[PDB]
Amino acid sequence: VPEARAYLRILGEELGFASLHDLQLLGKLLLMGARTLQGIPQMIGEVIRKGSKNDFFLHYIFMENAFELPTGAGLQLQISSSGVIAPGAKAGVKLEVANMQAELVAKPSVSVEFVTNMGIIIPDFARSGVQMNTNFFHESGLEAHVALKAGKLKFIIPSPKRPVKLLSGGNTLHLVSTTKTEVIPPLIENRQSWSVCKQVFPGLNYCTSGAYSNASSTDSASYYPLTGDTRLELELRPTG
Amino acid sequence: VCPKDATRFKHLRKYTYNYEAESSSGVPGTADSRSATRINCKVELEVPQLCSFILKTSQCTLKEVYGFNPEGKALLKKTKNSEEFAAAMSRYELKLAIPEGKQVFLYPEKDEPTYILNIKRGIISALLVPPETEEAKQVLFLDTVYGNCSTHFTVKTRKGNVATEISTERDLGQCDRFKPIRTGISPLALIKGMTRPLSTLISSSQSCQYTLDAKRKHVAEAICKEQHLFLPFSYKNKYGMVAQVTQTLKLEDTPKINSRFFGEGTKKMGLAFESTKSTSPPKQAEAVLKTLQELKKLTISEQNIQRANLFNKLVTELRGLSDEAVTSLLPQLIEVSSPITLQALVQCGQPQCSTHILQWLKRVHANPLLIDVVTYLVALIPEPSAQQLREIFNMARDQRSRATLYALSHAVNNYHKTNPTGTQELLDIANYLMEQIQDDCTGDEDYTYLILRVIGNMGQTMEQLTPELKSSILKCVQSTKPSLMIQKAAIQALRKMEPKDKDQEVLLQTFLDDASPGDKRLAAYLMLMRSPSQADINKIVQILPWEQNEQVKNFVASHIANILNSEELDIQDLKKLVKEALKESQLPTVMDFRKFSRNYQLYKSVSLPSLDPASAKIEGNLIFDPNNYLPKESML
The distance of Cα B168 from the centroid of its chain, to the nearest Å, equals 40
- Number of C-beta neighbours around residue A52 at 10 A: 10
Q: Distance (Å, rounded) from C-alpha B626 to C-alpha A208?
A: 98
**Phi, psi torsion values for A64, nearest 5 degrees:** -140, 135
Q: A18 and A27 in contact (C-beta within 8 Å)?
A: no
Sign of the CA dihedral with B252 first, then B256, B262, and B265 last:
negative
Spell out a b/e string for B458-475, using b for 16 or more CB atoms within 10 Å of the CB, else e. bbebbeeebeebbebbbe
| Number of cross-chain residue pairs from A and B with Cβ atoms under 8 Å apart | 224
B195 to A70: CB separation less than 8 angstroms, yes or no = no
What CA dihedral angle connects B99, B104, B110 and B113, to 10 degrees? 170
Which residues in chain A touch residue B171, judged by CB atoms under 8 angstroms apart? none
What letter would DSSP give residue B29? Answer: T
* Helices and strands (H and E) in chain B: how many: 20, 17
Burial tier of B229 (Cβ tally within 10 Å: 0-12, 13-18, 19+): middle
B279 at A interface, C-beta within 8 A = yes
Which residues in chain A touch residue B36, judged by CB atoms under 8 angstroms apart? 128
B185 at A interface, C-beta within 8 A = yes
Reference A66, options A113, A112, A114, A117; nearest CA is A117
Q: Distance (Å, rounded) from C-alpha B410 to C-alpha B309?
A: 41
Reference A74, options B242, B301, B113, B623; nearest CA is B113
Q: Distance (Å, rounded) from C-alpha B494 to C-alpha B584?
A: 32
Name the β-bridge partners of B417: none
Reference B220, options B162, B153, B164, B169; nearest CA is B164
Q: Which amino acid is it at B581? A: A
Q: A92 and A110 in contact (C-beta within 8 Å)?
A: no
C-alpha distances out from residue B27 to A130, B228, B244, Å: 9, 12, 11
Q: Is B588 left (phi over 0), alpha (psi -120 to 50) or beta?
A: beta
Query: Pick from A111, A124, A187: which is nearest to B279 by CB?
Result: A124
Query: Pick from A61, A122, A176: which is nearest to B186 by CB?
Result: A61
Q: Distance (Å, rounded) from C-alpha A14 to C-alpha B612?
A: 28
Q: B398 and B365 in contact (C-beta within 8 Å)?
A: no
A215's CB contacts (< 8 A; 6+ apart) are: A187, A189, A190, A221, A224, A227, A228, B29
Q: Is B539 left (phi over 0), alpha (psi -120 to 50) or beta?
A: alpha
Spell out a b/e string for B344-377, using b for 16 or more CB atoms within 10 Å of the CB, else e. bbbbbbbebbebbbbbbbebeeeeeeebbebbee
Q: Distance (Å, rounded) from C-alpha B315 to C-alpha B304?
A: 18
Nearest chain B residue to A21 by CA distance is B446
What letter would DSSP give residue B415? Answer: H
Task: Tell me if residue B363 falls in helix, strand or coil.
Answer: helix
A222 to B26: CB separation less than 8 angstroms, yes or no = no
B79 to A126: CB separation less than 8 angstroms, yes or no = yes
Which residues in chain B touch residue A215, judged by CB atoms under 8 angstroms apart? 29
**Phi, psi torsion values for B105, nearest 5 degrees:** -140, 130
Query: Pick from A14, A118, A178: which is nearest to B241 by CB?
Result: A118
Q: Distance (Å, rounded) from C-alpha B334 to C-alpha B6?
A: 61
Q: Distance (Å, rounded) from C-alpha B203 to C-alpha B232?
A: 11
Angle formed by the axes of helices B502-512 and B534-543, to 10°? 0
Which residues in chain B touch residue A28, judged by CB atoms under 8 angstroms apart? none
Q: B537 and B582 in contact (C-beta within 8 Å)?
A: no
Q: Distance (Å, rounded) from C-alpha B457 to C-alpha B434?
A: 15
| Interface probe with A: pick from B20, B24, B30, most Cβ of A within 10 Å | B30
Sign of the CA dihedral with B519 first, then B525, B529, and B532 last:
positive
Q: B79 and B86 in contact (C-beta within 8 Å)?
A: no
Q: Distance (Å, rounded) from C-alpha B241 to C-alpha A130?
A: 9
B307's CB contacts (< 8 A; 6+ apart) are: A57, A59, A86, A111, B295, B298
Q: Would you say how long chain B is, in residues?
A: 636
Q: Distance (Å, rounded) from C-alpha A181 to C-alpha A176?
A: 4
Q: Distance (Å, rounded) from C-alpha A71 to C-alpha B181?
A: 12
B309 at A interface, C-beta within 8 A = yes
A130 to B27: CB separation less than 8 angstroms, yes or no = yes
B495 at A interface, C-beta within 8 A = yes
What CA dihedral angle connects B514, B517, B520 and B521, to 10 degrees? 30
* Helices and strands (H and E) in chain A: how many: 2, 16
Q: Distance (Å, rounded) from C-alpha A159 to C-alpha A146?
A: 15
Which residues in chain A touch residue B223, judged by CB atoms under 8 angstroms apart? none
DSSP string, A101-141: EEEEEEEEEEEEEEEEEEEEEETTTEEEEEEEEEEEEEE--
Reference A126, options B336, B85, B290; nearest CA is B85
Q: B169 and B206 in contact (C-beta within 8 Å)?
A: yes
Which residues in chain A touch residue B189, judged by CB atoms under 8 angstroms apart? 61-65, 82
Nearest chain B residue to A228 by CA distance is B30
Reference B132, options B169, B159, B150; nearest CA is B159
B183 to A16: CB separation less than 8 angstroms, yes or no = no
Which residues in chain B touch residue A128, judged by CB atoms under 8 angstroms apart? 23-25, 35-37
Reference B449, options A22, A215, A24, A216; nearest CA is A22
Q: Distance (Å, rounded) from C-alpha B397 to C-alpha B413?
A: 19
Q: B216 and B10 in contact (C-beta within 8 Å)?
A: yes
Nearest chain A residue to B114 by CA distance is A123
B347 to A75: CB separation less than 8 angstroms, yes or no = no
The distance of Cα A179 from the centroid of its chain, to the nearest Å, equals 24
Q: A202 and A239 in contact (C-beta within 8 Å)?
A: yes
Residues of chain B by 3-state class (helix, strand, coil), percent to 5: 40, 20, 35
B66 at A interface, C-beta within 8 A = yes
Strands B154-159 and A76-85: unpaired
Which residues in chain A touch residue B446, judged by CB atoms under 8 angstroms apart? 19, 21
**Phi, psi torsion values for B325, nearest 5 degrees:** -60, -40
Q: Which amino acid is it at B333? A: L
Reference B227, options B172, B287, B281; nearest CA is B172
A227 to B413: CB separation less than 8 angstroms, yes or no = no
Task: Tell me if residue B270 falls in helix, strand or coil.
Answer: coil
> What method did the depositors use to determine the structure?
cryo-EM
A70 to B145: CB separation less than 8 angstroms, yes or no = yes
B302's CB contacts (< 8 A; 6+ apart) are: A90
Q: Distance (Å, rounded) from C-alpha B555 to C-alpha A180?
A: 81
Q: Hey, what long-range contacts does A212-217 have (CB within 8 A, 24 or more apart)? A: A212/A186, A213/A186, A213/A187, A213/A188, A213/A189, A214/A190, A215/A187, A215/A189, A215/A190, A215/B29
- Nominal resolution in Å? 9.0
DSSP string, B433-484: HHHHHTTT--S-SHHHHHHHHHHHHHHHHHHHH-HHHHHHHHHHHT--SS-H
B122 to A58: CB separation less than 8 angstroms, yes or no = no
- Number of C-beta neighbours around residue B636 at 10 A: 8
Q: Distance (Å, rounded) from C-alpha B116 to C-alpha A115?
A: 31
Q: Which amino acid is it at A203? A: G
Which residues in chain A touch residue B194, judged by CB atoms under 8 angstroms apart? 65
Which residues in chain A touch residue B89, judged by CB atoms under 8 angstroms apart? none
Q: Which amino acid is it at A41? A: P
Q: Distance (Å, rounded) from C-alpha B456 to C-alpha B488?
A: 11
- H-only helix segments in chain A: 20-38, 40-50
What CA dihedral angle connects B26, B28, B33 and B36, to 10 degrees? 50
B406 at A interface, C-beta within 8 A = yes
Q: Distance (Å, rounded) from C-alpha A21 to C-alpha A14?
A: 19
Q: Distance (Å, rounded) from C-alpha B221 to C-alpha B247?
A: 11
Spell out a b/e string for A210-228, using b for 16 or more CB atoms within 10 Å of the CB, else e. ebbbebeebeebbbbebbb
Query: Which residues 70-89 of chain B have a CB within 8 Å of chain A?
Result: 79, 81, 85
Q: Distance (Å, rounded) from C-alpha B488 to C-alpha B306?
A: 65
